[PDB]
Amino acid sequence: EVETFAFQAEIAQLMSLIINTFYSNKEIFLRELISNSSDALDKIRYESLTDPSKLDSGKELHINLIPNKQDRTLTIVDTGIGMTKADLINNLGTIAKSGTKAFMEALQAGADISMIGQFGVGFYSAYLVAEKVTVITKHNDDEQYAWESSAGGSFTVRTDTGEPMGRGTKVILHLKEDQTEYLEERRIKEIVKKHSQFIGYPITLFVEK
Ligand SMILES: Brc1n[nH]c2cnccc12
Ligand SMILES: Brc1n[nH]c2cnccc12
Ligand SMILES: Brc1n[nH]c2cnccc12
Ligand SMILES: Brc1n[nH]c2cnccc12
């Protein structure tokens, strides 16, 4: 069972601007998704302060970066709080409509795309390098779900029959053909060290065969 939704017009306008505007500093996508993972990890840790059983789905709080050259995918895995089905449909738990409004007004007022994170819509920078994004997520209060979109004005949500996640979120970036540099080991370390050096969680860059 697959449900297909239309993006709100403002969100579809945001993704098309990200996809079509000439902008070379594409590496900021990783900082934004890592920052999102850190926020999700902060929340589940806070809830565990008064209810330790919230970590029964996994006590480890970490971020993994998994490149796969054969699939041409870069996967950002975290064990944060995760998202419910309603959160996924609700623009992945953000106020993306009002956040996009402020972002596009800043852009005409001198801003550039790299400041997208200060507006709560940093997730959509993933489409600087990915032609398709798959979000697998598991919240303690819901089942495991899969969110997917190749832009084009629509996204799908389905029950995920894949590997059970325990708790957290998996962001799978199906990279564009000319953006495979973000699967190289030394390129990812350089980006993590320059934009994410103060994330308060272990970031493990998986290596390949
Ligand atoms: Br948890 C969660 N849901 N949506 C988010 C967007 N940015 C950071 C964290 C989250
Ligand atoms: Br939106 C988003 N990007 N990365 C995440 C990790 N956990 C929850 C929500 C998100
Ligand atoms: Br943590 C978290 N849950 N939902 C969010 C939306 N924006 C930023 C951070 C979060
Ligand atoms: Br929870 C939550 N929903 N939306 C948010 C925005 N910023 C921080 C936390 C949240």
Swiss-Prot record:
Region called Interaction with NR3C1, residue ranges: 1-209
Location(s), subcellular: Nucleus; Cytoplasm; Melanosome; Cell membrane
Residues holding ATP: N36, D78, K97, F123
PTM description: ISGylated.
N6-acetyllysine carried by residues: K43, K69
Outcome recorded upon mutating D78A: Impaired ATP-binding. Strong interaction with HIF1A, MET, KEAP1 and RHOBTB2. Loss of interaction with HSF1 and ERBB2. Los of interaction with TSC1
Impact reported for E32A: Strong ATP-binding. Strong interaction with HSF1, HIF1A, ERBB2, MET, KEAP1 and RHOBTB2. No effect on interaction with TSC1
Outcome reported for the amino acid change (mutating G82D): Abolishes ATPase activity
Family the entry assigns: Belongs to the heat shock protein 90 family.
Protein task: Molecular chaperone that promotes the maturation, structural maintenance and proper regulation of specific target proteins involved for instance in cell cycle control and signal transduction. Undergoes a functional cycle that is linked to its ATPase activity which is essential for its chaperone activity. This cycle probably induces conformational changes in the client proteins, thereby causing their activation. Interacts dynamically with various co-chaperones that modulate its substrate recognition, ATPase cycle and chaperone function.
Record remark on domains: The TPR repeat-binding motif mediates interaction with TPR repeat-containing proteins like the co-chaperone STUB1.
UniProt subunit comment: Homodimer. Identified in NR3C1/GCR steroid receptor-chaperone complexes formed at least by NR3C1, HSP90AA1 and a variety of proteins containing TPR repeats such as FKBP4, FKBP5, PPID, PPP5C or STIP1. Forms a complex containing HSP90AA1, TSC1 and TSC2; TSC1 is required to recruit TCS2 to the complex. The closed form interacts (via the middle domain and TPR repeat-binding motif) with co-chaperone TSC1 (via C-terminus). Interacts with TOM34. Interacts with TERT; the interaction, together with PTGES3, is required for correct assembly and stabilization of the TERT holoenzyme complex.
Name this polypeptide is given: Heat shock protein HSP 90-alpha
Classification of source organism: Eukaryota, Metazoa, Chordata, Craniata, Vertebrata
Record gene name: HSP90AA1
